[PDB]
Amino acid sequence: HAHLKSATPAADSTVAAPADLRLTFSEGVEATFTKVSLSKDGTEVAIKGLETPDADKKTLVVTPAAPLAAGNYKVVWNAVSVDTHKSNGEYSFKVK
């Protein structure tokens, strides 16, 4: 099972807008089977891509279609690990 070890931006942090979201899991994950929702102040934000760029597949990069406006963001993820298993979670962060 892939558990979220950390993310950038971090849960409950306030940051200047990043270029992408980066979730690091306890196990490798599969970008084709994994799903991620992003919302700002309760409104869906468009995701152009998912990818795991590294050989170990532990960091999932979530690329928004456009630059991230200031606001309160919620991330919902449903992961499929290289070990086949499902996991899911949520966290929130702020773009100042």
* Residue numbers at the binding site for Y ion (CB under 5 A): 44
* Identity of the amino acid at 10: A
By beta carbon distance, the residue nearest Y ion is 44
| Residue nearer to Cu ion on the CB measure, 13 or 26 | 26
CA angle 25, 65, 55 (to 5 degrees): 30
CB 36 within 8 A of CB 5: no
One of 5, 35, 85, 86 touching Cu ion (CB under 5 A) = 85
Element (H, E) at 38: strand 35-40
Question: Which partner in Cu ion, Y ion, none is near 85 (CB below 5 to 8 A by kind)?
Answer: Cu ion
| Residue nearer to Cu ion on the CB measure, 21 or 29 | 29
Least Å distance, CB 30 to Cu ion, is: 13
Lay out the sheet containing 47-51: strands in order across.
4-8, 21-25, 59-64, 47-51
| Residue nearer to Y ion on the CB measure, 2 or 68 | 68
Binding region for Cu ion (CB under 5 A) = 1, 83, 85
